[model samples]
Target: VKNGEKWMDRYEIDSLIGKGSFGQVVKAYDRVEQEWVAIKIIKNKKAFLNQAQIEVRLLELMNKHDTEMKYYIVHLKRHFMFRNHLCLVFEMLSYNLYDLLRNTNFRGVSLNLTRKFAQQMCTALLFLATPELSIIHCDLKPENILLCNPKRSAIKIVDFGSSCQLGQRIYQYIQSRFYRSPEVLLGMPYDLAIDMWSLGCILVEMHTGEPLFSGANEVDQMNKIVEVLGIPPAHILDQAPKARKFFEKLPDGTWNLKKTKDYKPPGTRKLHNILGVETGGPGGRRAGESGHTVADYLKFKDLILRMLDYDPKTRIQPYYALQHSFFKK
Candidate 1:
């Protein structure tokens, strides 16, 4: 596409912003609205078009109910087709959470900063979980969360390409490996709680500057989770279709993690040690400066544990998560 080329004789294309398997996003100026916007020019393939169609529908649903625009979800201005390709226009936003972390040199931001992000995300989740809307954001990694401004604390969640409404799930393989839930890894029926699991992993990474479970593959991912949270409960494992791949059923009926050659013992890489709650790990340096006490870390850890619950049935829900002690002013 040429610079200053108009789409629908309204959006003036500016420059390429980013690109991926889906297609490329361009910075464009909306002539009708006289404002800047991001235009996602989806690839003209059946598969990509099909997914983009779902994305537009969900975004439209979220935006309609969010008339006040309090929820931190990206707003889709409109959509159109150009040259046999589908296009989505959205409000222009700044860098994604991953970019923000990169800008921090992966040292991570303060707990106070992470808290701000956590609260907003919980609110957004609450919005998504309404009985009428019950949407599940199949993907919720840092790369999909963008800052509203270059230097602001506010943000918005984006990329609903892999999302689905409750009871309408179409994909079996979902979520990025690092933030993937136990149910997903074990091939069990999953719901909104899966995103809570991702939120737990994301919060830890935001404050610690590294992934809580950075596994290379599905097996490695399970092993990494075991290293921190220990094995899944026997009942959870017993019913899971994919459990045999990551666990062994002992003759006596006890379950054991199927250890790979590189396995680390269960609970070896403890969350406490990783968070440096008492040991003053990586986040300790900013404690005094940010007024984030050890007590705050304790509350944060408790909320995270609830979010990371191995049993989807018992995992923390968004409404209850917002009421957690960690969200106290």
Candidate 2:
């Protein structure tokens, strides 16, 4: 706690709030204004600093109203370098979705609540996928979905250190294991659609209070996804080099998931309900039977399928998702 230490001789270093691979976030007090600010300090490393600059650029881009990223994303208030670390100051936010889920024991939230979060998320992604911005959040996850405050349920997307404009990625394996997209898994060129896929996974997790696709590793990740979503189409399978390596061709013209040496697929049937333990649907263990209409749940299911489509071209776009009945009526 550097309570007395002044950063840039302007802000007082309050306390550490969070930490990550690239850096950490701290609560800093402004000496002049007497207000607290959230400062994200990036590590003093070549690659980390480069990534930090990219994040700073993206955050600055989000600031301009015409860019319109302020609707559903957390924007930086200011930025500067302190000592060897690059520091970014932003409006302080409350706990993220994961924090709330942890409080609930990961049992999951109601579909009604999930729908609100999902709709807002789509709105955020829609802006990112716009022709003007075309930003792709490669590391979207529950931890990155910060609640607007501790009072209401409003949420905002955070952490753009791994974000890049579509067709301009800087890393190989992006996103957390459970939220990783199929195109990323197959080593195929990805775009904002990958973020769409991750959003679908997140929505399901919100409802069920668990990861939609829980993979142990990259290979295991693909296996878990295929087990529920079914085999990829021949064209998508044939598109990437890693695709052929991970899947095998059967004599009957079908593909087999071969992640490890002599590895076999999990079972013949797809596991649609990764967390389908009780109600056997989007909601949790035997409740309301869900409080949601049958038609409503069916519509929700359809939207999820489209978002998780193996073909990136076929996967639901953010524009289309905003119009999906799941969020409409």
Candidate 3:
């Protein structure tokens, strides 16, 4: 609907908040509730409309947990059909994580802020990965995470069209490239642990202000992970024969991939090096108001290492991840 128009005789359409190939999101005023809300209008095509219904059902389930878990996961108010389009209503969000970084001109936020964001995300993941629901957010990245307020790290996940239930991951090829899990790359079976893999990459990106795995293509992506974390286990690649194109076995039975074309190796910068010891500051104190210590940084690195593990089965779970030392006071 156009701006200033009364939609469905209840809400007033204010402005266009978002737009994509499949649908458009708008900011609107809910007269019945006297509050602001977001309306996602999906194209009336068969596939898009069906996917919208799936996303709405997922949100409805997630809303059931609102009372117990409130790390700012998006709550859907309702959805309806209008002019042959499926409209999904949601609580108005301040901004996406992408906008948050853009406000700071792409520089990494302080360690203090970064940790809060990481913890909040893990919290969301924790709830999503619960046994009953087991919602595998196949797409977890900065762009899909929305901030509750501009100043704080409070955030929630959005866009569930690409998501699936744990026992039933409908689509094999899911998740953004940079945040994609290793098992997904190798064409193997997967589970909730896939979300954990993206978490590590996302947290590091917050600290470094750039993607940890900046692979241009599938092969490059595999090499990028190998560069920092070393190659996947022989058992991992052994099952997935497709891996032969990207990696080779050495005399010692170690697996390594040759550099790609025109690839002057940026070399092994390691996760810790790329994300420094969070000790630097402009004045007497530290950069971030209360920057994390060296020990804290290493602990965080260890968590990331587990999250980025080659074997999805062995990867950290959301509940276990919340108990990590990095989050301890």
Candidate 4:
């Protein structure tokens, strides 16, 4: 690929902006539209082409509903094929959340900013969860969320390469490791609640400047979560086929963490300690300086706890989550 080369005799390739296993994303100028766009060139390999086709299909459906572009989802302008490669043209955006974090030296942003981001995300989630759509953003992380503008809190979620609508699931191994829900980890059937769990994880990382559960592997990930939220109830653990690898059934039928070097006692790691929302704690830099009251912190924590609930059935849905006290003020 060379700079200034025209694709489909319309898009003038400018420079490469992103590259991934899927293929390459290049900044380009749409001669017909007279504006900048991102062209995602899918790898010519059969496996990659098949995956990219799904992304195109889903993006088209989502764009149909968001014809007015009100939703916080990235817009797909158009797609084309050139040189045996599928190229998706998307509206160009700036500064993904991960880039924003890096700009702040990974110290994180204020709750005020996080609130604005949360509200938009909740709105998007609500749209996706609507009976008419029921889309699942299988991957939701800072890297997938891009700021609408360089200096604004408004954002648009991108990368549906791994997403699927309800009743259209195809893969068992989905979602990134860090933001993975307990249901997925336990090998239980999952639903839209999985994305809610990811949102919960993202919000905490946004404020704390670090991942809440920075596990290195599956065992480590489950152990880290257990340290904070404790093990799941008996029924959930009993039903999960994968639980056998992580837990042991005691004589009285109670479940306990399996002996592993990474294992920690349930509830050993308190969520509060890492949150730093206290006025006097070492991580309380945002407590007084940002004017966010103790009540505010409590509300945020409550919402996160609900979103991160072990039971997918009980996990907070987007509709009710928007009504939570965290977003009230």
Q: In angstroms, how far off is 67's CA in candidate 4?
A: 8.0
Question: Against the true structure, whose lDDT is highest?
Answer: 1
Tell me the spans in candidate 3 whose CA falls farther than 4 Å from its real position. 249-254, 258-260, 263-267, 278-289
Q: How far is candidate 4 from the true structure (C-alpha RMSD, Å)?
A: 1.7
Candidate 3 Cα deviation (angstroms), residue 133: 0.3
Q: Order the candidates by lDDT, highest first.
A: 1, 4, 2, 3
lDDT of 2 by residue, 91-174 (tens): 888999998889889888777788889888988998887676789989889999999888878999989989998767878778
Off by over 4 Å in 2: 31-34, 67-69, 250-253, 259-286
* lDDT tens per residue, model 3, 9-123: 7999999998876699999999999999999999989999988888888888887764455455787889989889989899888888777777767666666677788788888
- Estimate the TM-score of every prediction: 0.96, 0.91, 0.91, 0.95
* Residue range 64-103, candidate 1, lDDT tens digits: 7853333689889999888999999999999988988888
lDDT of each: 0.88, 0.80, 0.79, 0.85
Which of candidates 1 and 2 is the stronger one according to TM-score? 1
Write down the worst ten-residue block by lDDT for model 4.
Answer: 279-288
Tens-place lDDT per residue, model 4, 118-212, is 88898888888877678899999999999888867789999999988888888877889999888888887778889999999999889878888
Candidate 1 Cα outliers beyond 4 Å, as residue runs = 67-70
